[PDB]
């Protein structure tokens, strides 16, 4: 726990949409190699031999994403063969888990400089392409009371009393703040446009955004055995109010993100300037049938672990998997509406599963410097009833 | 925007709609003899496809025909060779617009038939593949294929995408794409590239419109719908996600790297990448991936090397670039070959195979008969593999007449001597037939090192004496090095030039000089390897450097086929060629290695022992005593240094030949090096290698000079660049 | 800061590939069976203090997809706060899970972590997940992808390891694995697999052929992959193919679990530490030879802990191929009586994702049984990587 872990670079690709997406023709490996080459462009004199590991989050590591895609990125990009490369999967927070694991590796002292991040090309490898030990095993599925995240979100909105207008109001707000951030040039240096083997542009913006979203347009959208199974556990609930549509839920997109993490001595030797410091990380969980109330104990755990309260955090970044999950998280901890997802979220820009955690982490590093603020807390709900949170402090 | 036009040019397509609504698009570029995928075509097909969509209500089918002797052949090479890396966005949009036209034609909702009247090559076949039915006229000279890989390109007009959709990844790559195989109309129908055949070109349009009439009646729902646009489509052999194909798919790049032996040819690598990546997505996304890989090749250097050599240089040669102007034609009635060795037997075969009557003479009837047996054994293989009939094989061998009497050279008007390499022997052999052959008979010699002028004195008609240099095996080596002695007339040059094209080989015209061009330049290649062996480099690394440089045969293996006798005699003969001029012949380091191998009794495959071991005539691994002899392993230079040492040695020696006047054109130097001695095709020739060199120093002639001077500092001043390559 | 200790280290028996006993057993069931065994060892253990479950799995598809670590947490009825993450570092995933667990405990942000791996190769064969280095021709053509058996034969060719030499090591692995089972070394650590009725399915390592003879090993038989390898290793004229199914790692099904936590975490839950994680290291080497990663990773973990070869009592290197271990033994001059003393994967099998945790727990038991001090555990990896770990008995 001795060594302090610092963030030196945090970039990502634009998120290409699912249907007729610009990134559909781009192999998931290429999205990562593109970010590796951008880091080389920003630091041409960095001794890449001092990079001891490359940790990528990936929820569907099959096909174009199978065979340890992190190791493939190391070999394909011509990185030193001693730079390792490992894939991990903790569902929605795989990107932040890769960052946290990269941070804890530096803290143990047995690693110097680590590449963390994630990759997910959901237009080429749809969610669920990896099968699953719970889906292909009816004996397990019948016992663990499996239920999709969409029903859990509706169940949250039902219990907490979030109306269809409530969740659509957040969705409209996400589209607005995401459009303001892009217009204001906030993402100018962290969103690295994707190009082909000829240098031709493929995508340079989060093309899933619908900035002209109206309250009336969201009201016209339609909602997305599982309904009965959920109420078999929440027996005091009579009817589930299905309020979540494709306009207030996270978008299926392709994308990737890289974060460079290392000790203070490592960055000093390679001439890097630390942008923020990993203050604390935490992993908790909640009910594996509501499947989306996980980030509430994980945030309290990381705040208590860092010795901070809600008031000490300047910016709260929670993944916009479903609108009700954010409203519940905001209702539980009394988060100021002006501090939550200040630059929009996955509802507007997309949720590239295993890469999202590193994307919204780098988003907070840029906004902490843009606002000259001090502390940001980043968290993501997870399937299976899990949660991962992280506190960073600007340096 | 999303248009059929690229952005004045001539119209190249004639429009004709009949009373049945069948529109006949007849391609007829008035600016040339062949329909070419140039800017005039793109604009004309853009207008035509626009009109097919505008008049869709009154059109029931489309026929694509041609008014040339060929159907359609190739794209705009003059434009793709000028595409700089900054022009990549334009090359992308060009093939993107080309394929947007063909895709609209392919998804018109009505059947489109191709009326293939002749050759449909490259972009020509790509237009045909966009149609729903292909009808070919089974005429002579007609070929179909996608030969883009032979120019360092790839079928970027939909060839890769459609053949993969038609045949699957494995079949389309191996049979069509990877090597640009050309097929006759019968073979094309057999493998699935053509759907049916006709006897004459006049039946094409009537049979095409008839197929439209029947398709609309019998298949109303599937009319004008390709198999990959019909739902439930299953790609042959499966997709890369199919378990059967995913088991063998990782072995395709390693198999390709074994066939190429590690040579830096990126065109087949890109074809495989585009083929596999395209099978993972929809058809339109697959075609755009194919466009990006195409622009990657065009803007690259190897494609410019291969476009320069195998298109511009080769056409200039076939167009008589080195043939003297004004000279007419002269028939050849009876070819008289002197000598029944492996050379004369190969010369007699390729001449008889071309239809010529050959008189094959040696010193004994037993010997001349064994020479004809070479033609019989080759015909047996051709009969076994079913490449020739029993009738033509009998007619071919019937033209070869073995003999031992000089009187049988009566009526010969084209003498080709291929006896032992000795001057006074060649003088004697020519003297006893020069009075028996016709008075205008060409007197050709197949010498490899002796100057033609010295041999020409052995005959009284020195004006008709000329060097005709073949390469073993003659039945497969495609070059003939035509050497011009001082007394050789321009008519003799043109007569041998026309003969070379007649037997299906490619000629180069070289002025008389010791070692000519092919023998002199390939000597530097071998001499670099033998030096590296004496310097202590591992023999395996030497052979690997040769194979990975792109040569068809590694250097030491070649040194056993040439035999160190013919090799050592060049050392003493080239020595004295400049020894008598106050010149100091500086001995090549490799001479010590040649002599010690002869001292140890290992002189080549002819002896049965050389750098390799030969068990009952089959090579079986490097001679294990080789490492102890030359202390192999004590010098471990970079493999790229070994590769460049052999390439630069030949490239610098070529520049000398151009400077000395041995060669008159870079086209002869490039094609002569490639087809004559086996210079790697990716270089574009031993002269194109200089202007297309690419390495850590950069790309161009300047980068070449820098890399040459670098090698000179490390391995000897023989790598110093000539004055002519400098500023 | 914190020190990471090993409190428990168990594994399933390894079921063979053809007609294997574990072929009807889902890989999730293999892990849940070991969780239930740990509960039997410590029924009063507050499972709420378990903050994560880290499993290695090289083919996370099908029965092994969907974060099988999280599946084990839910199916076994562990607390939902107990995490669950799958990782894949090819052959080292089992030991990488243990190393990551130790590093997470050292950082202070994790108290008690369950690590290990699972691989049911008879149900999910390797390569079932696809991948870019094999199924993308653009990058496959650039990394010089060559199967690891060819790299092993290349190692034997260069180092001068004869067919008799590799078969001699294979015989030794069978003998040492047979002696270990007969001596009861594996009685506590190998947890027999049973069905939903308690009926036995497997209780020993089926791949073992303890009646192996040098004469039987000699009767065994050993794409342009050979030419691709020699293109890089240009000074080698020909590859001597010495590796057969008798001198290479066996394809098996198995799982392994390791419980790791701080000294305070174990003391709070009434646990007794068995060994301390001294240091971990990761290094790599040429991916075309694909089996030279162990040597720079073992040297790094030795320097990082301020130790030499003489300071190590036991050396445990995964027996992927006989030439890899002989190469490793030659380079570091490992004494013969210190190397894989209880046999290895040639005899007992190599269930990819679980192997690192298996041979790790094997050294925890042998250090205690011999009353020795230190052991070094390392594995070669596909792609040219390598991990190493030093443990000290407590
Ligand atoms: C003989 N030899 C070697 O033995 C060798 C090498 N590079 C590494 N090694 C070990 N090279 C280039 C080499 O020629």
TrEMBL record, chain B:
ADP binds at residues 639-640. It catalyses: a (3S)-3-hydroxyacyl-CoA + NAD(+) = a 3-oxoacyl-CoA + NADH + H(+). The keyword Lipid metabolism applies. Residues 515-614 form the 3-hydroxyacyl-CoA dehydrogenase C-terminal domain. InterPro entries: 3-OHacyl-CoA_DH_NAD-bd (IPR006176), 3HC_DH_C (IPR006108), 6-PGluconate_DH-like_C_sf (IPR008927), ClpP/crotonase-like_dom_sf (IPR029045), Enoyl-CoA_hydra/iso (IPR001753), FA_oxidation_alpha_subunit (IPR050136), NAD(P)-bd_dom_sf (IPR036291). One of its GO terms (cellular component) is cytosol. CoA 5 binds at residues 171, 187, 190-191. Residues 335-512 form the 3-hydroxyacyl-CoA dehydrogenase NAD binding domain. Keywords: Fatty acid metabolism, Lipid degradation, Lipid metabolism, Lyase, Multifunctional enzyme, NAD, Nucleotide-binding, Oxidoreductase. CoA 1 binds at residues 34, 73, 75-78, 182, 315. Belongs to the 3-hydroxyacyl-CoA dehydrogenase family. This is Probable fatty oxidation protein FadB. It comes from Mycobacterium tuberculosis (strain ATCC 25618 / H37Rv).
